[PDB]
Design a protein around this ligand. Structure first.
Ligand SMILES: *[C@H](N[C@@H](COP(=O)(O)O)C(=O)O)c1c(COP(=O)(O)O)cnc(C)c1O
Ligand SMILES: *[C@H](N[C@@H](COP(=O)(O)O)C(=O)O)c1c(COP(=O)(O)O)cnc(C)c1O
Ligand code: NA
Lengths: 360, 360
């Protein structure tokens, strides 16, 4: 039997998607070959990548004046690609840092331009999002960078800051296609697929067309947005199978009723877990400020922290796996992405109630 | 029915490997999840990447003092990573250019250091390999770059030049694991997996351990060999499912008897096609000099070139697809990688003989 897989990325996937991929793995739609053997210059793969793009455009209501790029290298490669493409070496980028993934973006961007961290959550252990009107943005900043869902720290933007001088860029890796997003407010949205929308090996970049072009001279060709855009993500050999898998996920999210329906389910199942924590009378604790609690990644600790290893081991015996926190922070982390069944969060909640009764 | 798929990359894969992947896709070995859902930091995936590495080490007889890295970005990303990691910006790299893939590696390296093309086959249409003793290598060249199998032009190194000042770097994308290689002759071997050893999304880099480190300060962290080496290719989220597929391919190459036997089969089926061309009294032509004719990619043309579209259409109607040449050169190109069944080459040869008879 399949387990309830609380991993933060790569992560659990819908069973109907996995079964479709199994059904077609040897011979996709009578083409006589697997997706994994198709030429990226051929008509079958063309149909796949084009439908993945159109389905994603439908899901997020992406306006026509945005490009959609399917790339390799992870969100971490975009930490370099963003300043290399969007800035000159003496331009400045503003960052709002609400957890360690935004901090990693700052440190990589320092190689390629000037960076200003205009706000950091670190003094309160990355539990909060700033009041935006209070933000002091840099008068000449090319763009303002956020990590919309801080996967380790469980801090999620529920509304967005307005850039003063330039455009907004958001790492949406761990809440990608979890809810509607006004894409027009952003110059760039990017995310690795593996958290919430596919297998690892694909990164999606949604980028306003008038921002493509004029990358720095030292930009590798494989990081150049203009190269990717003008070749429709087929400049070199793309991650064909991962793009196909993302397409299955997008098609299925549309069948579920789209991102408004996805968000409803995420909110419901996240409420069950957060309520159980809040009702445990301190036995379980979530440090994050209520209004920015992530629907995707739920970090929590035990008041008796020495009990956390037993919690994690017994949960895994109960077929609930990968609940240990990220190694940087420890504690526990329940990642409850789109495809996590409601019954899995219910099982974790019932396990938590039973564990507390036995250790209190 | 499945077709004979002569694509140059991505390419045909073994049917037993595809079917193994299919049977484990929903729940790998009763572990309760797909490979596609496994955490890269969990023991199941660690077991997979570790065996893929040791199996590849067995196949190529890789010495202990070399690292094996499983990366994203394609071989094209390595065109930037090689000089970024291995050179200072005022160092010089020598290139022997035997086709257009070597030319693409020169153009990218020029962003990051100096380049000398010490020999180029362009003047004779990329049909030959130089005499090595006569090469004029640059006295202080950090390394000498070759493309061991020029995929579009059908030119293949059968033995290797000896670098004068530095070490040898070879792009082996399209003949990777087609035959034994004395790895100790090289400082770096690299290759996209999708030509001969898996689906696209994985690039393999075999690099002598004393060459790792001291990349240029502008090197993106995701292109840095020391980062990847010290994290055992798990610095960020790896292309887990492509690595797993590579592992299945490697396991099956071992079961076939290793690269000595793989090479024997490649030589046998290449000979059938090359002999058919030479016996065709000019009806089909291969321009490449006989001693360097690739076993992996066989470009050929029709004396009556106006027949090429009918040849390709009739071949496809006979379940032989993707025989058109690379778009940069035209003609025909039969890619006949490890997994291309002998029967597919035989069908091609018989179809060619019939085609000539009908268009005498
Ligand atoms: C991915 N975060 C995951 C994985 O973290 P590690 O175990 O340290 O690799 C998490 O568990 O938090 C992530 C990334 C990085 O994307 P890749 O380069 O691996 O594709 C970037 N931004 C966000 C918000 C992430 O969650
Ligand atoms: C891959 N060459 C293939 C693919 O060529 P395109 O259709 O132009 O993409 C071919 O048909 O010749 C190749 C590469 C590039 O690898 P990726 O960056 O796409 O992974 C580099 N070197 C060699 C020898 C190649 O064959
Ligand atoms: Na099975």
């Amino acid at each position: 039997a399949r387990v309830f897989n609380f991993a933060a990325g790569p992560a659990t996937l819908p069973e109907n998607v996995l079964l479709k991929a199994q059904a077609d793995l040897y011979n996709w739609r009578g083409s006589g070959m697997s997706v994994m053997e198709m030429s990226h210059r051929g008509k079958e793969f063309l149909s796949i990548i084009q439908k993945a793009e159109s389905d994603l455009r439908q899901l997020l209501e992406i306006p026509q004046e945005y490009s959609v790029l399917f790339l390799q290298g992870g969100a971490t490669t975009q930490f370099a690609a963003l300043p290399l493409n969007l800035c000159k070496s003496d331009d400045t980028v503003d960052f709002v840092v609400t957890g360690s993934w935004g901090d990693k973006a700052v440190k990589e961007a320092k190689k390629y331009c000037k960076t200003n961290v205009i706000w950091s959550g670190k003094s309160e252990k990355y539990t909060k999002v700033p009041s935006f009107e209070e933000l002091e943005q840099t008068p000449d900043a090319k763009y303002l960078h956020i990590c919309a869902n801080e996967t380790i720290h469980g801090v999620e933007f529920k509304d967005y800051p307005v850039p003063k001088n330039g455009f907004l860029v958001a790492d949406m890796s761990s809440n990608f296609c979890s809810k509607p997003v006004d894409v027009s407010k952003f110059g760039v949205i990017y995310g690795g697929a593996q958290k919430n929308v596919g297998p690892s090996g694909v990164t999606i970049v949604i980028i306003r067309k008038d921002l493509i072009g004029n990358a720095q001279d030292i930009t590798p060709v494989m990081l150049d947005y203009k190269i990717h855009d003008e070749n429709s993500s087929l400049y070199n050999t793309p991650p064909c199978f991962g793009i196909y898998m993302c397409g299955l996920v997008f098609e299925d999210l549309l069948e579920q009723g789209g991102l408004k329906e996805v968000e409803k389910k995420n909110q419901r199942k996240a409420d069950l877990l957060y309520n159980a924590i809040e009702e445990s009378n301190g036995f379980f604790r979530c440090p994050v400020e209520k209004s920015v609690r992530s629907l995707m990644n739920v970090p929590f600790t035990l008041e008796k922290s020495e009990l956390e290893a037993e919690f994690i081991k017994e949960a895994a015996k109960e077929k609930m796996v990968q609940l240990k926190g990220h190694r940087s922070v420890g504690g526990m982390r329940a990642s409850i992405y789109n495809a996590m069944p409601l019954a899995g969060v219910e099982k974790l909640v019932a396990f938590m109630k039973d564990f507390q009764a036995k250790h209190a």
